[PDB]
A = this chain, B = another copy of it.
Amino acid sequence: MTIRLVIVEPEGAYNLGFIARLVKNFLIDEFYVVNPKADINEAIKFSAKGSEVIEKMMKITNNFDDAIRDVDLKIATSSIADGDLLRKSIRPIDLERLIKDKKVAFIFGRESVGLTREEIAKSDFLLFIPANPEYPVLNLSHAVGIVLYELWRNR
């Protein structure tokens, strides 16, 4: 079981840095970032001190397709709890069974607008993190940390 974190066009340096820290906290295997908008130099200040996750490990790609090659499963995320989208909808309780023995890309979208409908169409599953139904939209890095933690919660 191998985990690739894919962050699509992150906008905030704090988010990018905080995600990089989480990659070390949770021993993520691969860290890909599509066309980052955030200033990488600024992001480094929020990453795990001495870790070089941004500097060395992080792989930048130009487009979505180059970040989702060579995996078994693509799990997109959304703050909207949804047809085709219901059909691919999952929850955190589902993850353990689905990712067993697989190389999985966990894909997160833009702070402004999320993932596009086509990015979701290209993904196998669409994960929603349960939260207040009246305000379920989590900040990007906090969503990432919750998902990564779910890979660790029985330690």
List residues of A whose CB falls within 8 A of some B CB: 14, 18, 21-22, 24-27, 46, 48-49, 51, 91-93, 129-132, 134-139, 141-142, 145-146, 149-150, 152-155
Contacts and interface: CB of A to CB of B under 8 A. Distances in A.
A51 B132 CA distance: 13
B132 A25 contact: yes
A25 B131 contact: yes
Given A24-B135, A136-B25, A155-B91, A142 B48 contact: no
Given A24-B132, A145-B142, A153 B92 contact: yes
Majority secondary structure of chain A interface residues (helix, strand, loop or mixed): loop
Given A27-B132, A49-B135, A22 B152 contact: no
Tell me the number of copies of this protein.
2
Given A48-B137, A129-B149, A142-B142, 18 more contacts: A21-B139, A22-B138, A24-B134, A25-B132, A25-B137, A48-B139, A49-B137, A91-B153, A91-B155, A93-B153, A130-B149, A130-B152, A130-B154, A131-B149, A141-B142, A142-B145, A146-B146, A149-B149
Contacts of A93: 153-154
Nearest to A146: B149
A66 B146 CA distance: 30
